[PDB]
Design a protein around this nucleic acid. Structure first.
Lengths: 271, 46
RNA sequence: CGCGGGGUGGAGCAGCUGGUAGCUCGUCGGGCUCAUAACCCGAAGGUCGUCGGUUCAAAUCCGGCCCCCGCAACCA
RNA sequence: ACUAUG
RNA sequence: AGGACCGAACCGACUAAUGUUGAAAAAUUAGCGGAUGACUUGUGGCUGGGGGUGAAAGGCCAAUCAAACCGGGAGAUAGCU
RNA sequence: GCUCGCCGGAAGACCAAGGGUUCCUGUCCAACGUUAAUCGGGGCAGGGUGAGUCGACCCCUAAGGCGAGGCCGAAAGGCGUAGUCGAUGGGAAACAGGUUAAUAUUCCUGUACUUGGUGUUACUGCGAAGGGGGGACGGAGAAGGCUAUGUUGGCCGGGCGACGGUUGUCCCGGUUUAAGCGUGUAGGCUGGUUUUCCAGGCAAAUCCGGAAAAUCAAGGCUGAGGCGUGAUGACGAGGCACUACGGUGCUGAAGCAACAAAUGCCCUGCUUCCAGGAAAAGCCUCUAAGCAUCAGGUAACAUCAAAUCGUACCCCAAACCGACACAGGUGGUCAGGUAGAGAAUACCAAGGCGCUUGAGAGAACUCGGGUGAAGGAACUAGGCAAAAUGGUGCCGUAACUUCGGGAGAAGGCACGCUGAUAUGUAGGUGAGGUCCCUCGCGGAUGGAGCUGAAAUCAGUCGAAGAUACCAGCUGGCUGCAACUGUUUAUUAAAAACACAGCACUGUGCAAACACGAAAGUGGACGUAUACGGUGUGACGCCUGCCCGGUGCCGGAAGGUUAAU
RNA sequence: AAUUCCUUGUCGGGUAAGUUCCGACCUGCACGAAUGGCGUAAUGAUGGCCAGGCUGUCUCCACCCGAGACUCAGUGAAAU
RNA sequence: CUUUAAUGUUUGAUGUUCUAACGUUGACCCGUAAUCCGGGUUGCGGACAGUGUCUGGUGGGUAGUUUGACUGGGGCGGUC
């Protein structure tokens, strides 16, 4: 539930936090953690290739299973955990042979819930199966693109691809952007929406809350001097350009997909 | 005031020391140039 | 002052490439109406700011004078 | 295709 | 509970006076702002010159910056002194 | 040497860095020392640094570096796999006393502990480059248990006072003792044990994970402190004597209790919150290849080993960084008394200093302070500066408000010392003794002693009781920016930048975009509730008209048009 | 009006006297809606104005305490 | 000659299939103790994508430059 925190200081006034009582309190499951050290947006040449990233809080990497490749063997949901790498919450699952893995928690999924993969599996949220074996109409998530590679589409909080057509080897997906798209139909997809769909309703409320998520300040071109940005100088507050990126390419309008090999799979570009 | 030189022997010897120079092409050219000049200290070592 | 633009029936406008003054409204006269307004028909009206030149001929090309706008009048 | 006022 | 309040250390640098061949190539005295955080600090590391980094002042990059420093082209060129 | 003054959360003591002989002794005063100098961090000569346990070295990894093969690149080279380096982090072990002019956890005296090797004896399934466990981790908060430590009493040893009193409820000094070993407490965590089966842990596993029954509830892990021992010792205020008056020798009293108490320890605990909090080895355990009388493993005893390098001295500084013996800068540790909320402030202890020119004078003027008749901002660009306000408790408190604020609004009142209530209360602590017991570091009652607020009433001194140091000036209208932040190191701290929030736009993942001739890397071990760019800038009410111009988007008929 | 040239606009308030301030008017030289418009409690080493308190800020300076100045001894610069 | 037909013919380019170049930042196997690289097996793309030479468009993203003289100082005006 969302919670308008009361305005006792000026930085608490506008905060709205997303409390989940159902989450785990206590340390996450140890075998599935890795080191994951931060970049500050810099590459193997040391140069900032991506501005505004830097700092924030330390974070371990939870090894999620996006493949879901362990088949016919039923699995029970132990608990829902917080995951800092990710808008979605995740669920620890225990298989009938005593293996544990993390998975993304779909909407409507609590402790005790059986969930199953592969082709036999019943069409109920949690369950993963090739898209030949799903009904047209259905609402899915964590969808592959090449068979065996692992889920890529519809992993963020509250998202779902939606299956609109069969036609031979391929199927068609209304992606969440509004973009119809063919994917070949041996590809897996979990069923349901993804959980935590109130995540958009949160409000950070102060500058510092953005810094905690590793996000440095952003300086407007029109603030800068002409040497630093196209938006440059002016005595007072001028503009009189056409808006552009720091490297001089038009923003506001100009399309930037050139990728001809993936074009055949796109039924229709977004609205 | 804090002044610019804030000495540290580890940092001296990793910036400028003998094995630092003998790494790169350009740092060997440096040692040649000061052998050739005839220079008592080559580098910043002991 | 330096630069540029404009003064045309009563009103707002077009005509300025020398020989030919139009457009919408207003005025006047007739109709329709019990009467007025609208509507229908018919008729007029312009020294082209002002003075002087140039030409056979000037609203028109050229100069002075008068009024009216706009732009400029900066670096210390 | 008609229309307003006294 | 809090980029909450008062206030030492610690970080800073608003006012004044002194100093201006200084005690000091940016300080001192008296007051001043923050002070559980977008804080502060040690050790080590990465980013290199039309390049870096910049909560953006053309700021900072070894007391040097609208293009560092060292060497070279180089005795540049100088209708000027 | 005797007075005087200054620091004392430092101007004291101790590490790291950095320096490198500045350390100690003798000797010299040319130069160096902002003066003299017999002195010196100056000159010359001699001396001084002692380690199985402290630190490096070493074993392990982080960010990062290098990088066999490899991929890429006119060349030089670039990136990177296997690997191999890299602390600021993880990994065995020591304390007290003594002693030099100069070292000491290093030497000496005592008392310890650690890990290896070889050998003997007894017992025996050992064994990875693999499996699992562990190591192994955030912020805030609270308050219970302790100790360091301090104060008072008791005990012991001195003293009976230069000036009135001072054999007493008087004065001065001492009352110290470690690691280790033993016991296992306040507390904290956890059901325990045995058997059976099982698509998991790349193979196997008796280990971990999983599912099942059966059986007793109390077993296990962790853990400060205390007590015991170490200690018949060591230290110990002094006394008895020899002295080149520096010190050398011999002996040695008491050595308890109560109260208060950390920011230190239990505590890597517990409670809670969202921003969800390293790695690898040592360590414990499991087996595979392999080897079974062997080898190896477990315990006990002996015996040998623990190399090398650092060790002086300075360290908030005359030894480091600032050209200086420079009012600056420099990470960590320790934390006595009285007052006090306090690591503020005042006065002091331990300890350390009087800042390497002095001596007179007591003009103008300048610097830094004190006071001021009457007036009180008339000063001035401007109350700049100065003055003033200032504490605790209690009463009381407006518009406006996002209901939190505004607010310490404003503005009042009380405050010293003595006594009584009560020869010291409420409260805190808690001995002796009785009672009990799965008999101890146990429980019950019990209240001696110790400590000790706050209030009321009665008295009393002063001009003044928050008496010093310390310690808000307040109120009213209005511009700008919501707010905390950031900024021109060295004339600008702001109305500038940022901000939470809003909107537009790009991006379907080998994403857009960025750095790279490329390989490749960031974006992201993310996937449209996500990511990049641009503008606006909390919140509230809102956000009108124009697509001619310039961009961008879409459209394809026709025109025009390149190489070919 | 951080925007208004003319401009010390005009009117009201505050002062004995107000080119500033506050409230209005609209004749907007040349405001205006995310290069955002109009409002806004709280916050501010932010700009402007007023009031109480306090004062050597001033009328208008006086005296005192220290450090230099001055004299003596020793050392001994600099710009030009 | 005009118009038009099937005889044959050389090139065209517009689809649709295919697989064998090429792609694969799909899956598995090996070198190997290795998320690099290479090799193999198998899928999916597929003459598209992508790289070279030539070529049109765009291109202050970057660079090199230019931006006159007279003038009762320069600029504006005027002139050459």
């Amino acid at each position: 539930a969302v919670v308008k925190c009361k305005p006792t200081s000026p930085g608490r006034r506008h905060v709205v936090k997303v409390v989940n009582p159902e989450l785990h309190k206590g340390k996450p499951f140890a075998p599935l953690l890795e080191k994951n050290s931060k970049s500050g947006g810099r590459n193997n040449n040391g140069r900032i290739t991506t501005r505004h990233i830097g700092g924030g809080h330390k974070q371990a990497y939870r090894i999620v299973d996006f493949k879901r490749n362990k088949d016919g063997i039923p699995a029970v949901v132990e608990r829902l955990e917080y995951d800092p790498n990710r808008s979605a919450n995740i669920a620890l699952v225990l298989y009938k042979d005593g293996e544990r893995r993390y998975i993304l928690a779909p909407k409507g999924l609590k402790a005790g819930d059986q969930i199953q993969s592969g082709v036999d599996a019943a069409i109920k949220p949690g369950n993963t199966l090739p898209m030949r074996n799903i009904p047209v109409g259905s609402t899915v998530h964590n969808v592959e693109m090449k068979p065996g590679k692992g889920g890529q589409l519809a992993r963020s909080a509250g998202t779902y691809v939606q299956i609109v057509a069969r036609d031979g080897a391929y199927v068609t997906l209304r992606l969440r952007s509004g973009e119809m798209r063919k994917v070949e139909a041996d590809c897996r997809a979990t069923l349901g929406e993804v959980g935590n769909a109130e995540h958009m309703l949160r409000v950070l409320g102060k500058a510092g809350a953005a810094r905690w998520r590793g996000v440095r300040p952003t300086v407007r071109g029109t603030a800068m001097n002409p040497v630093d940005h196209p938006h440059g100088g002016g005595e007072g507050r001028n503009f009189g350009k056409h808006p552009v990126t720091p490297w001089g390419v038009q923003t506001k309008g100009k399309k930037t997909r050139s990728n001809k090999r993936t074009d055949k799979f796109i039924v229709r570009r977004r609205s | 005031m804090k002044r610019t030189f804030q000495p540290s022997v580890l940092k001296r010897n990793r910036s400028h020391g003998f094995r630092a120079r003998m790494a790169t092409k350009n740092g060997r050219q440096v040692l040649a140039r000061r052998r050739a000049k005839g220079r008592a200290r080559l580098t910043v070592s002991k």
